[PDB]
Design a protein around this ligand. Structure first.
Ligand SMILES: CNC(=O)c1cc(C(=O)NC)cc(-c2ccc(O[C@H]3O[C@H](CO)[C@@H](O)[C@H](O)[C@@H]3O)c(C)c2)c1
Length: 158
């Protein structure tokens, strides 16, 4: 089991860390959602699908910078949503193919009432997402750590 990103970086067998850079809607109103879709950013596969079933969770999702200060919301993982920043570990998603498959994670972030002006700065860290991979074969328990950076400013209108 290993993963790759939309910026040409990777994390091998055994886990590790990678940076991910996301284009964000430049204007988000209070009462509306900024959607940060990582399923177009992070992809993984199973290296022995004939024999091994891989299990993948979102173990933890943390907010940073302007997201920490200026937003609240949820994280959607494989069709169900949970509070973000996270308060538990999600259920497992199965990976059962050698073919790249997206990691089905998306943030739904809505501005807090005091947000206004530039609420997320270009280049800043906005989140860290921990993917936990296990399997039905041995005792491997690996963390794939995804550091999520904004490519651009996000403004909350006054
Ligand atoms: C003597 N030979 C053999 O023992 C052996 C023959 C084959 C083989 O015949 N393949 C066609 C494949 C394998 C193989 C590959 C990857 C692998 O582990 C990696 O990949 C797994 C599946 O993604 C992850 O669960 C795991 O955490 C890790 O990342 C493990 C445990 C075993 C071994």
């Amino acid at each position: 089991f290993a993963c790759k990103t939309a910026n040409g970086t990777a994390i091998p067998i055994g886990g590790g860390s990678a940076n991910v850079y996301v284009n964000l809607a430049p204007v988000v109103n209070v009462g509306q959602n900024l959607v940060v879709d990582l399923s177009t950013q992070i992809f993984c596969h199973n290296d022995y699908p004939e024999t091994i079933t891989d299990y993948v969770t979102l173990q933890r999702g943390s907010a940073y910078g302007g997201v920490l200060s200026n937003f609240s919301g949820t994280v959607k993982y494989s069709g169900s949503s949970y509070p973000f920043p996270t308060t538990s570990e999600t259920p497992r998603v199965v990976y059962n193919s050698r073919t790249d498959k997206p990691w089905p994670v998306a943030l739904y972030l809505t501005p807090v009432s005091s947000a206004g002006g530039v609420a997320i700065k270009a280049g800043s860290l906005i989140a860290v997402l921990i993917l936990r991979q296990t399997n039905n074969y041995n005792s491997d328990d690996f963390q794939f750590v995804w550091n999520i950076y904004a490519n651009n400013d996000v403004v909350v209108p006054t």
